[PDB]
Design a protein around this ligand. Sequence first.
Ligand code: NI
Length: 341
Amino acid sequence: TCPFYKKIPGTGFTVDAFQYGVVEGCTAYFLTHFHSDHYAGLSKHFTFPVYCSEITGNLLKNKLHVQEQYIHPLPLDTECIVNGVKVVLLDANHCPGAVMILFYLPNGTVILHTGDFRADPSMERSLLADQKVHMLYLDTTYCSPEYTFPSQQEVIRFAINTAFEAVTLNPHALVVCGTYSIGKEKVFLAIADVLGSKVGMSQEKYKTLQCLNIPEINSLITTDMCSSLVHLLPMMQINFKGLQSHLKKCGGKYNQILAFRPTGWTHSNKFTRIADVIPQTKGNISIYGIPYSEHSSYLEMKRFVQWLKPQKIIPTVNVGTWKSRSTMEKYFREWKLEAGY
Ligand code: NI
């Protein structure tokens, strides 16, 4: 049964609620982004209207085979009417195609559902500037002050400089990057651009990337692994055993691997600066864990909420324990007392 924090009151709508069967009273299912915890339950047998971004709708049709007649893609930054209710989709600064949804209820209530997001000051000049929000359904993934990490631009500077140094010292080194979902494509695209290479990958991952409307993508990726010195592998294979095995497969073209695991936060964040990050090494294999996040840090989240000044906050992440819920409620009250709303 569908939890309350997936339901939009005063509408027929749900958000990211496909794993509960037919939800009573739901006339339109919204999907914020193509991550498995959120799409869980969708398939070619789904026969209700799904509302989403264009990129999300390319992935539903090509990867999950949802039939076209049930996909309703909406343009961003554009007022649209869905089943009698005005909605707007906004860029969430998460993975490709990810949105926040603004719902203008028939009684005058305005609701923002962030989906998954990485808050940014650029959001203070979107269509959110223009009116008051009564209720915020908030991605609280990293809602505690221990969660710090650098900007995405500092992380990509570290990765490019590390890869370019290694391959210029040893032209026979291979770079490997882990992946298990869409998102974080800048990691491997920026490294392949500094090296003058395409990114090589499996046919299944090439298919997924071809749904993303990334400009000039045919110039940047390939299924011909032999032609590429940046390879993408499943995240589970980014370990010494899995990398040794991959290096065997390349037929003596390479004699070293430098590998990247873009994680979110790890507790090495509480001690080490990006500048000071070092790899784990075994023989001719090195593995870097780099803190590339597509969710808000604590400080980014706090700034967004203190700017928006919502009347009520409903967390959508970390809701399953009483200790998490009480922690989060305490921070919300601090933020509201400090800012004065
Ligand atoms: Ni996500």
